[PDB]
């Protein structure tokens, strides 16, 4: 029959890193896994910064969609870094758009 696509969005854990000027980093774990015989595009927008990139040269601009697709899993990599937290905890909103 005609396949109706479903996606698991987890994945299936956060980022942990006064007034010591140095550059700290961390990483977490979010995946998207559809089940089409066809790739599915999806979009991630995140509302001291965070990156899709190992080596952090690709920013999640505030409220700007960032493009993704899949094949029969896909990671939504997140890489943090810090020379707008508060206390220090931040709560970021991650929007996955199909």
């Amino acid at each position: 029959h005609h396949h109706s696509t479903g996606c698991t969005v987890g994945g299936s854990g956060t980022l942990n890193f006064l007034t010591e000027v140095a550059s700290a980093a961390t990483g977490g774990n979010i995946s998207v896994t559809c089940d089409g015989t066809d790739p599915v595009d999806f979009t991630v927008a995140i509302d001291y910064n965070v990156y899709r990139d190992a080596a952090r040269t690709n920013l999640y601009v505030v409220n700007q969609p960032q493009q993704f697709t899949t094949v029969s899993a896909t990671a939504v990599p997140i890489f943090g870094a810090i020379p707008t937290p508060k206390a220090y905890k931040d709560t970021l909103l991650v929007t996955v758009n199909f």
């Binding site: 698991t8 066809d38 697709t69 709560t91 991650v94 996955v96």
Partner: protein, 223 residues
């Protein structure tokens, strides 16, 4: 929170009052969600959302325990305008219950239909759409700087585009944020200079579209 969501492309055909979307918390921790449906429009050349009563979700809040599969009911309140595709977003919000943490919002497209037009994802709606000249996206393209690509849909069905080609058998061009061109809508979005000039040396270009059963090429006319 970890959710399986099915279907990711829900629709409500003309002869239907309601559809369902399933949300299963496949995590080991309980979760709470807020569920809302927004009217979706592309006026002003950008995606807008607004409060709406045409489609009502049930329940509007839910606790979904670890392993639990919940059924979202999505009810069409009254018949929608004849011959037209209405566009919505269904929004699921995870409610919270040197460390930065994560709070998910999932947003999936939802389409509903008036008489004479359908999703084309079934035999019934396919035969409905066959008898209807505009039951499909009909796209026109145009570049203009201040470089932005404008896409106008004259059809009564949205297009979901993953790629643009300058020829039927060619390769998809650069494009260093775009996908949906709703019906009777026109969308605008940024492109590279090299992209703009490359579109300048032709008049017909092609979208990779997934609005229907299969991926297919559609032709886009120069405005």
């Amino acid at each position: 929170a970890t959710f399986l969501i099915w279907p990711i492309y829900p629709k409500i055909e003309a002869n239907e009052k309601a559809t369902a979307v399933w949300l299963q918390n496949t995590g080991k921790t309980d979760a709470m969600v807020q569920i809302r449906v927004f009217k979706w429009n592309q006026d002003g050349l950008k995606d807008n959302y607004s409060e709406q009563s045409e489609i009502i979700p049930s329940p509007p809040v839910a606790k979904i325990k670890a392993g639990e599969k919940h059924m979202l009911r999505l009810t069409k309140s009254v018949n929608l305008p004849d011959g037209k595709e209405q566009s919505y977003r269904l929004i699921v919000d995870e409610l919270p219950i040197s460390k930065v943490s994560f709070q998910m919002r999932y947003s999936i497209p939802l389409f509903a239909y008036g008489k004479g037009i359908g999703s084309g994802l079934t035999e019934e709606s396919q035969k409905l759409n066959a008898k209807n000249a505009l039951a499909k996206p009909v796209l026109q393209w145009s570049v203009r700087n201040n470089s932005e690509l404008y896409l106008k849909n004259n059809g009564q069905k949205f297009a979901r585009l993953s790629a643009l080609k300058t020829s039927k058998t060619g390769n998809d061009i650069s494009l260093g944020a775009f996908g949906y061109v709703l019906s009777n809508s026109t969308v605008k979005f940024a492109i590279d200079q090299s992209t703009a000039h490359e579109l300048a040396k032709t008049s017909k270009i092609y979208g990779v579209d997934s609005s229907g059963i299969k991926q297919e090429l559609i032709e886009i006319t120069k405005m």
